[PDB]
Design a protein around this ligand. Structure first.
Ligand SMILES: NC(=O)C1=CN([C@@H]2O[C@H](COP(=O)(O)OP(=O)(O)OC[C@H]3O[C@H](n4cnc5c(N)ncnc54)[C@H](O)[C@@H]3O)[C@@H](O)[C@H]2O)C=CC1
Ligand SMILES: NC(=O)C1=CN([C@@H]2O[C@H](COP(=O)(O)OP(=O)(O)OC[C@H]3O[C@H](n4cnc5c(N)ncnc54)[C@H](O)[C@@H]3O)[C@@H](O)[C@H]2O)C=CC1
Ligand SMILES: NC(=O)c1ccc[n+]([C@@H]2O[C@H](COP(=O)([O-])OP(=O)(O)OC[C@H]3O[C@@H](n4cnc5c(N)ncnc54)[C@H](O)[C@@H]3O)[C@@H](O)[C@H]2O)c1
Ligand SMILES: NC(=O)c1ccc[n+]([C@@H]2O[C@H](COP(=O)([O-])OP(=O)(O)OC[C@H]3O[C@@H](n4cnc5c(N)ncnc54)[C@H](O)[C@@H]3O)[C@@H](O)[C@H]2O)c1
Ligand SMILES: O=C1[C@@H](O)[C@H](O)[C@@H](O)[C@H](O)[C@H]1O
Ligand SMILES: O=C1[C@@H](O)[C@H](O)[C@@H](O)[C@H](O)[C@H]1O
Ligand SMILES: O=C1[C@@H](O)[C@H](O)[C@@H](O)[C@H](O)[C@H]1O
Ligand SMILES: O=C1[C@@H](O)[C@H](O)[C@@H](O)[C@H](O)[C@H]1O
Lengths: 337, 337, 337, 337
């Protein structure tokens, strides 16, 4: 008897999920969708031969009782609203970043969940399910390299749309690191600070590319995170964790080596879609399996999403001040941990 | 409406499949099993909370009509018998290597299939579904390195059981290469030959380890294939294809690099189970999806399995003669291709 | 007819040079030494079967006319004095870092050289002669990766003496980067800034280890330079230059790969002495050959050394202020370039 | 007081040596040359401002007493004659491969040396002085990977001259491996055998390219050695030694990594001249230093050269017979070891 899932946001990424759940994963089906382009959602449903209802809005869909869990995978700002609803409707919710565009927005969502007694919110920070990132977790948890001291890492795009704005860097993009980093080291972010290098020819003038973001944790770990979205050569995520006694570092994507025309190369991906495809599959399957066999979700908590929002805040603050902004994080509710 | 699958052979590897199909893959369920330790099969069924019938034998199970496809995943020699049956019962069959322990055995199976009009037999040579091996396929199909000329490759075990016999090398072990190699280059094996290096201390005396196997194709491609199952350091599969104008080579398994105590290392797997887990998942999902949306299976053909058997023959022949045995392959039936 | 060289400073490093010049290089001999442990100097002349005079001081030695060039390779602070002398004595001088312990000290040395009409001072920043660092230079000079934007690099020791002080990091250690970096990118250092991560267990408490040093150039290039001298695992120099369209990165020292006990490793050096041995050989040979066939020295200029001193200043300033210190560099005299 | 060296053979390679000795190495000078294009030799003495005599032949030059050691670096076949002479003239001789074009030719040279009481012959197999090959030696000598069992290695040219003949492969080319391999493992070659893969488009029809050469040692070690001189992509030497418990493998030449246009590459050399430049320098310096401080040469012995010749024989034999030729090696004279 499978888990019945409603998808709010029949967009590109919601479509990818509907697809994996329908044709790749196990133990769940899509019985309900609503888009804001109601027609788009109706086209999706035929596209993937679903047996699902098409609601005009989230309320209508959250109403429905043959649906016990929802994907919030719509336009970013409309997330918060949909989530709080689903929490009160006492259905399970998986929410693609952002959790809520604003920190307080996130906060409201936390408070709701602490009421409804259990863990219904999982945030879609898939990096935690990537095999490389997991091996990193595993190593640290094993003390392999002793006390973590600094972290060097980079997040690079070949290019971006004209739509890409100097803040999206720390908002849309650096957000995954912001989650995964503290996840790994199990520390909280004390301060952030931003430094702008010589703007790049491959970037449009209304955009500050690259950027560097230094971040300190409570413990004393220092992170420098390159973000460069017009690097032209490829899409490439890099993370090296220097420890007291050793260094561990994230792998490249698997690739066949080539010897030709003077060079000994491996392949670099050009399409962010490819880098994490398996992390998504694992992430979602975990939502499912986790629910059916535990009555609560498991991955990145509602809290973890708040931590993101605050920190993104401190970042855009530092973006404008070029000054060492503080990151004021609220009490971590006993509820969590 | 999902595909209903019967498993003949509730052993370790049949269990792994029952597990992935039940808890990992999409669009299929297990509705029928039979082991030869009838009790084992009954224990499996409870283990994985199945809703399946437990038959005393394959016949009983092939009888059943709520089953439209079967996994032959039992003890190696009992494969052939189960398969021919399932072909006449006009159900779909996925068969873990071997197809049939003897070449002619394979031949009977081919002839049956050519009668029953379509493609119901898929052989479990999962390497073809490994991402690395696929990139290799892709490159060649693209002529990247021009005409393939030689192949160097190795198949290494940390150790083996006391049960491991000097022929199992070319029978149980080198079989995957034997499939994947010709698959890649799209050529047939002309001759084989075996050379025994200085026997290894890590090997028991009743066993000849390592061994080298040279193989020529019709076209003129030369392959040398190390096989060494007591290499002590790990489990490691390596394949490099030298071409007219370039070289491509299989990747290592993804791994975090480490800098510690004087060395800059990556991880090597110790457990053959891990190396290919994802190839299995993909392989089986392909059986399923392929069936439901095409009315025929897709992967390694019944023919491809025969090719294996013949070639394993020529190998054990060369094993005893240390002489350049010929590989006499029969007409490839138009049926295939 | 070979170049006749006087060595002031018959210490460990001066000895290494006397050795390479006598038994490794071409076209020069040692005809004069002076130490401050006058006896230590006698012992050497014996050690290496020299045919050289032993002066009581630099003046005595600079007096001598059968000597046309000198190595200043004595205790750090005693450098300045010896060099100014040799400039007025109109002999050629190769000076191991530091040029002068203080910036002004360096300045006096520049002014002297601009008088004496030509180039007699070469500073021993050997990194510029390392084959890897040279390939980097070459690439950039060829625009391979377009406009350089950021640089990530690290300088790591296994451990240090009790003698090692929190400033030595930027004074003795980071100095090589400080030279090579701007050498490479052909830009001047605008600001520096220092950030102290969580002090390391492997470091004595009177010492701040690791440290991070951010540096901006006039042009807009940003550098973050890890310095960590108690990293325990090895001695390791790393440098990655991110450009507009590409990334180039310094190589590891050549090493045989090993597959054993679960890991696939390369070697890491433990002994800073080994990392650059060939850069020294090249560096010195270039002093020699450059002199005999050009009447002037070639490598890192007296100026380049001053640039170091100022920048080391700004660093120790930032060390104490944890504030973004400015680096005020004087006019670059036409003399140079 | 330096070593006085006569060069017989003022050709391209003899010139390279004259150059390194004059302008790179330590403790030796060139005081005597003879070519067969007597004029070519005059031009050289000028080219390199030597202070040397120009003899009309080797006899004239071996006569001379201000010369205590000679480079035999002339046309291949003329080697033997020049060497036997120099042995009787009781001068030291360094001889670039071949030692003698024929095995017996080598034999005569051995017998002469055993008479004249000591070691005066060093054969120019520079691979033994390459830093990578040395690390390999070192590892094995340390048992790191236990008993060596198989060796995979390859010797690849981008292309060759029209002058290149199907035997030159095993005669001019594979000769370095033939020396270094047995050097490393300290075993003698029992049999050889040759296998011709599908001839390559990049090769002229009068030439069989690639070739594979299998070789067994007395002990039981098996080697397969690819030789492919029209591989188009670069010049590349590769050697992997599989052992009882581990695998060690020769490094790539040092190179800066690049990230650009979708690929993550290192450089591959195109010019055999570059691959070993430092091994030559070391090799020759060792001849010098070894002589002056030991009264005998050190590197690859006259014997080692004979071993080459015999084995080259067995190879060209196998080249024509495509049959497993034997390698009949004579008693190793106590003289050696
Ligand atoms: N391209 C990228 O790199 C990444 C994109 N994403 C995420 O995907 C989400 C949106 O982008 P895409 O799905 O790729 O394209 P998209 O912008 O087309 O998705 C937004 C969709 O949801 C919308 N929507 C918002 N609230 C709704 C509501 N209450 N009811 C119905 N529809 C609603 C629209 O219907 C729209 O089609 C965002 O969370 C974004 O951050 C995820 C990872 C990275
Ligand atoms: N360990 C290894 O490296 C590999 C093992 N395998 C394959 O797995 C198969 C068997 O090994 P495992 O499953 O791992 O262990 P296993 O030997 O326990 O599996 C054999 C099972 O099927 C048997 N059997 C044979 N014919 C039967 C029939 N008609 N009805 C009921 N039962 C029958 C037994 O019941 C037995 O439990 C073979 O095909 C083997 O080649 C696959 C890849 C590699
Ligand atoms: N550029 C480089 O790669 C490099 C490398 C090593 C050292 N150095 C610098 O050079 C210095 C020397 O290092 P070392 O390893 O020889 O140390 P060491 O302890 O082995 O000896 C230093 C020597 O210099 C002598 N000395 C001091 N002042 C002198 C003077 N005015 N005249 C003649 N001799 C004098 C001492 O008697 C001593 O023998 C250090 O301070 C160091 O910072 C630079
Ligand atoms: N061991 C190595 O790494 C190595 C490297 C290069 C060449 N070699 C061998 O050495 C040989 C020389 O190569 P090269 O590059 O100088 O060729 P090259 O064409 O540039 O010149 C060969 C020279 O040897 C001279 N010569 C021939 N016989 C002579 C004799 N009896 N006495 C004096 N001079 C004589 C010729 O006049 C000519 O100048 C080749 O046959 C080659 O196989 C060995
Ligand atoms: O968060 C993400 C997106 O915003 C961004 O567009 C992708 O390029 C990133 O790699 C992904 O992690
Ligand atoms: O075929 C196989 C098994 O027989 C063998 O036992 C495994 O070690 C191999 O790697 C696998 O490919
Ligand atoms: O000059 C230096 C030393 O003082 C220091 O000890 C080493 O770490 C540096 O590598 C070297 O370049
Ligand atoms: O002696 C040799 C040459 O004849 C040949 O051309 C090169 O391929 C080899 O690398 C070199 O060792």
């Amino acid at each position: 008897m499978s888990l019945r899932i409603g998808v709010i946001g029949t967009g590109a990424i919601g479509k990818e999920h509907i697809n994996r759940i329908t044709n790749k994963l196990s133990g769940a089906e899509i019985v309900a969708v609503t888009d804001v382009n109601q027609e788009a959602a109706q086209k999706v449903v035929e596209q993937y031969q679903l047996n699902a209802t098409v609601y005009p809005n989230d309320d209508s869909l959250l109403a429905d009782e043959n649906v016990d869990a929802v994907l919030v995978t719509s336009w970013g700002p409309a997330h918060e609203s949909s989530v709080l609803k689903a929490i009160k409707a006492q259905k399970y919710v998986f929410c693609e970043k952002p959790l809520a565009t604003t920190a307080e927005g996130c906060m409201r969502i936390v408070e709701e969940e602490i009421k409804v007694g259990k863990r219904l919110v999982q945030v879609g920070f898939m990096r935690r399910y990537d095999s490389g990132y997991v091996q990193l977790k595993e190593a640290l948890d094993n003390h392999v390299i002793g006390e973590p001291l600094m972290i060097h890492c980079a997040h690079r795009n070949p290019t971006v749309g004209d739509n890409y704005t100097t803040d999206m860097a720390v908002v849309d993009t650096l957000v995954h690191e912001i989650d995964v980093l503290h996840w790994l080291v199990n520390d909280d972010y004390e301060s952030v600070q931003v430094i702008y290098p010589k703007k790049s020819k491959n970037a449009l003038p209304h955009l500050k590319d690259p950027q560097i973001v230094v971040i300190e944790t409570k413990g004393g770990i220092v992170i420098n995170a390159e973000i460069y979205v017009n690097c032209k050569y490829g899409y490439d995520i890099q993370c090296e964790i220097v420890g007291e006694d050793g260094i561990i570092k994230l792998p490249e994507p698997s690739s066949i080596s080539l010897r030709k025309e003077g060079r000994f190369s491996t392949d670099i991906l050009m399409d962010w879609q490819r880098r994490f495809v398996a992390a998504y599959d694992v992430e979602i399957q975990d939502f499912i399996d986790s629910i059916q066999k535990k009555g609560e979700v498991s991955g990145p908590t509602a809290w973890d999403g708040y931590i993101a929002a605050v920190t993104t805040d401190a970042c855009v603050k530092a973006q404008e001040s070029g000054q060492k902004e503080k990151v004021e994080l609220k009490e971590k509710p006993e509820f969590y941990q």
